[PDB]
Amino acid sequence: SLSCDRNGICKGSSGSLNSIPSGLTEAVKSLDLSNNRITYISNSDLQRCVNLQALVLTSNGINTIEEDSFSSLGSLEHLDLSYNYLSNLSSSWFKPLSSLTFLNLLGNPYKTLGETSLFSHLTKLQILRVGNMDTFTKIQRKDFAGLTFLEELEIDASDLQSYEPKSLKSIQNVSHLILHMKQHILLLEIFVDVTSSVECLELRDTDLDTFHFSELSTNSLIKKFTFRNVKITDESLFQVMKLLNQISGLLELEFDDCTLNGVGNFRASDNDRVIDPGKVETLTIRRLHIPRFYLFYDLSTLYSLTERVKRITVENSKVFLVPCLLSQHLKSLEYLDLSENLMVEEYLKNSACEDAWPSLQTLILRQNHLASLEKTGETLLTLKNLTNIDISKNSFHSMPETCQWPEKMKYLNLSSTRIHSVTGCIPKTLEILDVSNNNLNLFSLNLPQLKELYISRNKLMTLPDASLLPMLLVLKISRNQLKSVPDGIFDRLTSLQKIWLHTNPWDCSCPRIDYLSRWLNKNSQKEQGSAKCSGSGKPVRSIICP
Amino acid sequence: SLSCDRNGICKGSSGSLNSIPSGLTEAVKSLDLSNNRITYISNSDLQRCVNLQALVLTSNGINTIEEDSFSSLGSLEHLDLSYNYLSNLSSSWFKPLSSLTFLNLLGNPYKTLGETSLFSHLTKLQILRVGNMDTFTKIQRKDFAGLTFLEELEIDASDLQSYEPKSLKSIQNVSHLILHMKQHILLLEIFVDVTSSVECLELRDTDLDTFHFSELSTGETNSLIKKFTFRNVKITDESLFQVMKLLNQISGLLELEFDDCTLNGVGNFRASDIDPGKVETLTIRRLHIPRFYLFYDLSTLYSLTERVKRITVENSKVFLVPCLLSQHLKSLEYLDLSENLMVEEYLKNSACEDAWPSLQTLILRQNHLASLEKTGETLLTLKNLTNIDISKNSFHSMPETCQWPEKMKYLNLSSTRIHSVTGCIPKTLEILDVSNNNLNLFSLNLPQLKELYISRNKLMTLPDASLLPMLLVLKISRNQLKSVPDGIFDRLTSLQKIWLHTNPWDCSCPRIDYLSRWLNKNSQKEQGSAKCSGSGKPVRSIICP
Ligand SMILES: O=C(N[C@H]1C[C@@H]1c1ccccc1)[C@@H]1CN(C(=O)c2ccc(C(=O)N3C[C@@H](C(=O)N[C@H]4C[C@@H]4c4ccccc4)[C@H](C(=O)N[C@H]4C[C@@H]4c4ccccc4)C3)cc2)C[C@H]1C(=O)N[C@H]1C[C@@H]1c1ccccc1
Ligand SMILES: O=C(N[C@H]1C[C@@H]1c1ccccc1)[C@@H]1CN(C(=O)c2ccc(C(=O)N3C[C@@H](C(=O)N[C@H]4C[C@@H]4c4ccccc4)[C@H](C(=O)N[C@H]4C[C@@H]4c4ccccc4)C3)cc2)C[C@H]1C(=O)N[C@H]1C[C@@H]1c1ccccc1
Ligand SMILES: *[C@@H]1O[C@H](CO)[C@@H](O[C@@H]2O[C@H](CO)[C@@H](O)[C@H](O)[C@H]2NC(C)=O)[C@H](O)[C@H]1NC(C)=O
Ligand SMILES: *[C@@H]1O[C@H](CO)[C@@H](O[C@@H]2O[C@H](CO)[C@@H](O)[C@H](O)[C@H]2NC(C)=O)[C@H](O)[C@H]1NC(C)=O
Ligand SMILES: *[C@@H]1O[C@H](CO)[C@@H](O)[C@H](O)[C@H]1NC(C)=O
Numbered sequence A: 001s002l003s004c005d006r007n008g009i010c011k012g013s014s015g016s017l018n019s020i021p022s023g024l025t026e027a028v029k030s031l032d033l034s035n036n037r038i039t040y041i042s043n044s045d046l047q048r049c050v051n052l053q054a055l056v057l058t059s060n061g062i063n064t065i066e067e068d069s070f071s072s073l074g075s076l077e078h079l080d081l082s083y084n085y086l087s088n089l090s091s092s093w094f095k096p097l098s099s100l101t102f103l104n105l106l107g108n109p110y111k112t113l114g115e116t117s118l119f120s121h122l123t124k125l126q127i128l129r130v131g132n133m134d135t136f137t138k139i140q141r142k143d144f145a146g147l148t149f150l151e152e153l154e155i156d157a158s159d160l161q162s163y164e165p166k167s168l169k170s171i172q173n174v175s176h177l178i179l180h181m182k183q184h185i186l187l188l189e190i191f192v193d194v195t196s197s198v199e200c201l202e203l204r205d206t207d208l209d210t211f212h213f214s215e216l217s218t219n220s221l222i223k224k225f226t227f228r229n230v231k232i233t234d235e236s237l238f239q240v241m242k243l244l245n246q247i248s249g250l251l252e253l254e255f256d257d258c259t260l261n262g263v264g265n266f267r268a269s270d271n272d273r274v275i276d277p278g279k280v281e282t283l284t285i286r287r288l289h290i291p292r293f294y295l296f297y298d299l300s301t302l303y304s305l306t307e308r309v310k311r312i313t314v315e316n317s318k319v320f321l322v323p324c325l326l327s328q329h330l331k332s333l334e335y336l337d338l339s340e341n342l343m344v345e346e347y348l349k350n351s352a353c354e355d356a357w358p359s360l361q362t363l364i365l366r367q368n369h370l371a372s373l374e375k376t377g378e379t380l381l382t383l384k385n386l387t388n389i390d391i392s393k394n395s396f397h398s399m400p401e402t403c404q405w406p407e408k409m410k411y412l413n414l415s416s417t418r419i420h421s422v423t424g425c426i427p428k429t430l431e432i433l434d435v436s437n438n439n440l441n442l443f444s445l446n447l448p449q450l451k452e453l454y455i456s457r458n459k460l461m462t463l464p465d466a467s468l469l470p471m472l473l474v475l476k477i478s479r480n481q482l483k484s485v486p487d488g489i490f491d492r493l494t495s496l497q498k499i500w501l502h503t504n505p506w507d508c509s510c511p512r513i514d515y516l517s518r519w520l521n522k523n524s525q526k527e528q529g530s531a532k533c534s535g536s537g538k539p540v541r542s543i544i545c546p
Numbered sequence B: 001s002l003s004c005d006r007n008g009i010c011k012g013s014s015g016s017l018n019s020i021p022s023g024l025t026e027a028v029k030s031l032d033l034s035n036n037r038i039t040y041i042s043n044s045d046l047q048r049c050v051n052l053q054a055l056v057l058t059s060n061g062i063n064t065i066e067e068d069s070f071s072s073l074g075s076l077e078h079l080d081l082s083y084n085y086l087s088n089l090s091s092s093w094f095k096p097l098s099s100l101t102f103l104n105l106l107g108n109p110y111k112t113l114g115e116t117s118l119f120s121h122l123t124k125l126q127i128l129r130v131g132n133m134d135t136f137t138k139i140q141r142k143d144f145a146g147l148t149f150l151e152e153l154e155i156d157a158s159d160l161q162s163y164e165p166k167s168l169k170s171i172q173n174v175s176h177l178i179l180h181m182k183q184h185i186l187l188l189e190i191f192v193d194v195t196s197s198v199e200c201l202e203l204r205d206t207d208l209d210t211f212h213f214s215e216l217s218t219g220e221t222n223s224l225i226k227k228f229t230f231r232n233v234k235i236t237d238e239s240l241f242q243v244m245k246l247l248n249q250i251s252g253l254l255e256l257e258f259d260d261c262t263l264n265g266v267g268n269f270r271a272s273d274i275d276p277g278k279v280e281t282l283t284i285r286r287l288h289i290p291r292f293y294l295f296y297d298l299s300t301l302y303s304l305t306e307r308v309k310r311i312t313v314e315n316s317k318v319f320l321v322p323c324l325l326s327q328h329l330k331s332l333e334y335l336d337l338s339e340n341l342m343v344e345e346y347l348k349n350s351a352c353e354d355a356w357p358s359l360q361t362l363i364l365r366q367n368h369l370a371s372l373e374k375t376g377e378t379l380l381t382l383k384n385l386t387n388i389d390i391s392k393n394s395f396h397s398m399p400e401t402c403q404w405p406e407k408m409k410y411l412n413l414s415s416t417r418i419h420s421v422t423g424c425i426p427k428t429l430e431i432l433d434v435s436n437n438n439l440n441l442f443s444l445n446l447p448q449l450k451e452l453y454i455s456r457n458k459l460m461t462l463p464d465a466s467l468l469p470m471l472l473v474l475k476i477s478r479n480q481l482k483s484v485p486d487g488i489f490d491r492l493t494s495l496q497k498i499w500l501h502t503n504p505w506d507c508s509c510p511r512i513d514y515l516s517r518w519l520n521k522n523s524q525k526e527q528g529s530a531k532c533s534g535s536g537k538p539v540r541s542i543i544c545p
């Protein structure tokens, strides 16, 4: 019915509640009545919850809340009324909430935030979420009256129809503004009011296929502009970039789950010259969709705009070519993440043409279609500054006796590559090596500089030799088939700080487990997790021998 | 060390041989002395083999051949002097060979065929090969004087410097002409002489990057060429339009093939201002794109495929077949995209509105396809698709129900890493291949199936024959079958071929009676020989009480 813990954290999980339970007291610290059938909130339901710090009523279907229902909740810090049936909000609900830090009103069918300012008394408010998908159609200038500083403001303006000018300009500082909006009609009229107050701007759900930029009635404080679930065409992209051109200090541009398509027979004619890269140094593209029946587009002229970009992530976005032309324009690129794409070694060699990627130090090709460890090593050889190489989750299966790798390489990730053994293919220059989640039985490579070895989720029968890994700081060797370890082994690793030994079938026979059980107790702070004995589920740490 | 036969077949087994044997026989019908160090040929080393029909001397060090050394060879049919050190050719060697059918002279460092016609008396010659990669630089008009009909003519003119006009116009019919030529300078001058005589033209090794078409005043558009093959040829996006112009001279061209060719850009070429002709089959194999290629855009050529019926683009780095192209492929009935990298999702872009209306056979073997369900759905809208080969793709598993083109009669799921089969396989099938997988059971109801290929699995029990009434073919070899249900084969009234070999058949007589008796009564049906597990003795060779 209503289950609490020893410290007043209460939750109503049954879902068969028709009203707020009776007999709530000053000992209730948190009240989670999510996903119940509560319909009414009277002035007496919560009068004795003077110590209530969090009140969650998500997805209940609350019709009405009496004016003074929250009169006693002066210590409430977290109020979630999202997804109920409140079509009319009263400023008297929030007047007593002097300690309120989080307020969520999303998903309630109000057309307006009322004719009286709701948040004038929330002097401590930090996170405000407001709006809905269907009926929220007006933003008024009074709506955000007494709010000067907010950490996060989320406005679901999905079907907003009108925006009263300067409604949002009253908020001086907003670290993160999230704006849902299916159409772009109101986009530029909201932008002028928040461009000077927002640090991280996020636009969600908007259809920008036919977006056109027009000069603004206006410097900007936005450092990051995120587009999520947004639709863009090759034509409207140049308009979007003109909007980004108004943000002189923009550092980071991010497209998550967006859609890119052609308008049909569009060409780059005069937009090419009038585009300034600005100070954008990080580009992040995730899960870019291209319509199933797409119209072809050619945005190769945009390759030349990347000369100053330092950090690029293009994840899970159907990349099977990175042309040499593009890679040669990427003169400042230090970090490239191409995870979850369709790159094959053959075309990766074109990407590494002469004078390609001079500054690149980190290359991530996790979960592409890479097949040969050798060809990959030779492909990356001409990238002289490459130090971090992640080629995990590629079905390599095996490695030859000897390989070529970039000379400065110090981090190599061979996780989830389906290998059954390791060879000298792995260079001695490595400081960090990950060979987790494979099918290794042995690891006996001489890596005199290796600081960190990750080798969990294998079939290791014996610990690697400590003489071969002198400088080891970290050894993650959990989830193997280790039964014992040579006595005195860990004193050999003078620099050892963290070690994972759990999920191994440790033999806890006293004439053998003595050293390990003792070492664990003296070094409990080094062990991550706790090694258990095979038969009994008792920690090896708490095993003493005569 | 010469192993000879009573039928006259002799061999030069040992490789360290210095000369042709002395005192030969009238009973020699063949002579293979390949990979020897023979250097000389006198008239007395082979004056007795008047019944000789073949003579092979490849990879020898023959420097000279005395005049009339072949005087006795009046019935010789096969002469191979390939890869020797002959730099001077005499017409008296081929004077006596009135019955010669095959003559190979490739690989010899002669600069020309000589001032005397060499093939004037070879009235029955069918296959002639001549030239080499280093020194052959001239073709005189008399080179091919007395040759009227030939089945194959291979000319390795890699370093051809000069070509006398009309040298090859004398030959009236050549079914297959193979021409090696590094340069294209003499390409057009040789084409006009052969276009009326050649049926299958093959051009090898030529660099056509800067080839420009210039029409000769022949006006003999009446060409005999039906197939034009380019092998190991380098073409650019610019010169490709010039090659098309050359192909335009061949009004009757049916087949165009590029094997191991290279396509690249010249840097900044744009297609703005073509007749497909009769070309109905296009073949592209192992097309290479240079490591540091120059980008090219030949999408304008998509519109030239509207009359092609057969297309093979194998192992040519295909990620995409855009909807525009597949909409233009109106006549295409057969598409082989084996050994490519077709992104599974935009396989669905290829099957857009009005795509591939005539396509009956689609081969996507050995791409990177991952989902059987997504593949079948992608192909559903291709109404005329009857043959689908998606073998050698790592599907791993299949769901309970799938959607496939309603007319599908042939499905190839070989080498697909499946451990079981479900009703995803549609009942319309007549041919199913699920070979080289990890199946333990096959019990689908396929009332129309006539051929089941299911070898290289782990079948412990025969597929339920009651569910395959129309089976003509059952290849169930290389499995784990130990026994068979009694009378199973009686129900298969239309059975014609069956593979049972390489199974651990338990030859315990109180158990194996039916199978051993059936195989004896139906010997002509078994392909291979079923062997007993214990002993390697045939199953049909054991009779039970
Ligand atoms: O816009 C682009 N990139 C920018 C956005 C990127 C970005 C920039 C900066 C920062 C961040 C990101 C891409 C750039 N850009 C081109 O340059 C381009 C231009 C024309 C053609 C074309 O039209 N071509 C016919 C090809 C051709 O010539 N075909 C005929 C020869 C064949 C034929 C015809 C008839 C019968 C038989 C055969 C041509 C081609 O493929 N050329 C070879 C050079 C290239 C290649 C292929 C394979 C491997 C290596 C090289 C190129 C193809 C590509 C296409 C764009 C593109 O990819 N558009 C999307 C629609 C594409 C897509 C769809 C689905 C999945 C994934 C992507
Ligand atoms: O944009 C790109 N990469 C940048 C984003 C990456 C990045 C990395 C790091 C930092 C910053 C950015 C990639 C670049 N790029 C292209 O250039 C390109 C696009 C399309 C085609 C095309 O049109 N082709 C028809 C094919 C073809 O012609 N097929 C027909 C010939 C065959 C056929 C089949 C059946 C019957 C008859 C004919 C062509 C192909 O696949 N293979 C051709 C080479 C071979 C061939 C064979 C035979 C004859 C001729 C040619 C290739 C060719 C090339 C595709 C993009 C790509 O791979 N994915 C893009 C969608 C991704 C994206 C976009 C925007 C933002 C983020 C991600
Ligand atoms: C929400 O509830 C309040 C509470 O009654 C409504 O308040 C009335 O608003 C009208 C405006 O036309 C005033 O004339 C009344 O005096 C108000 N009454 C009270 C008690 O405040 C308010 O109208 C409701 N909102 C909507 C949209 O109906
Ligand atoms: C199913 O597909 C496989 C290929 O995955 C076919 O097997 C090949 O058959 C051809 C005969 O045309 C041989 O030349 C190849 O050597 C075979 N390759 C392999 C890997 O076996 C098979 O024939 C198809 N099944 C049919 C057509 O019934
Ligand atoms: C708030 O915005 C003003 C506008 O200039 C800026 O000076 C100030 O640093 C910002 N404060 C925070 C905490 O971001």
Ligand SMILES: *[C@@H]1O[C@H](CO)[C@@H](O)[C@H](O)[C@H]1NC(C)=O
Binding pocket: A358, A359, A384, A385
């Ligand atoms: C490598 O990085 C350094 C920066 O430390 C830079 O100066 C140099 O140009 C880069 N290129 C090579 C080849 O080292």
Ligand SMILES: *[C@@H]1O[C@H](CO)[C@@H](O)[C@H](O)[C@H]1NC(C)=O
Binding pocket: A366, A390, A392, A393, A413, A414, A415, A416, A432, A433, A434, A454
């Ligand atoms: C190696 O890559 C995996 C993902 O495949 C990741 O989870 C792991 O943290 C990486 N190893 C490192 C960073 O040492």
Ligand SMILES: *[C@@H]1O[C@H](CO)[C@@H](O)[C@H](O)[C@H]1NC(C)=O
Binding pocket: B088, B089
């Ligand atoms: C080739 O041989 C014949 C006869 O041995 C001779 O007459 C002719 O001059 C020779 N040619 C050369 C170039 O030696």
Ligand SMILES: *[C@@H]1O[C@H](CO)[C@@H](O)[C@H](O)[C@H]1NC(C)=O
Binding pocket: B357, B358, B383, B384
């Ligand atoms: C299939 O092929 C037939 C030719 O027999 C053609 O008439 C029809 O339009 C094609 N497409 C279909 C049936 O969808």
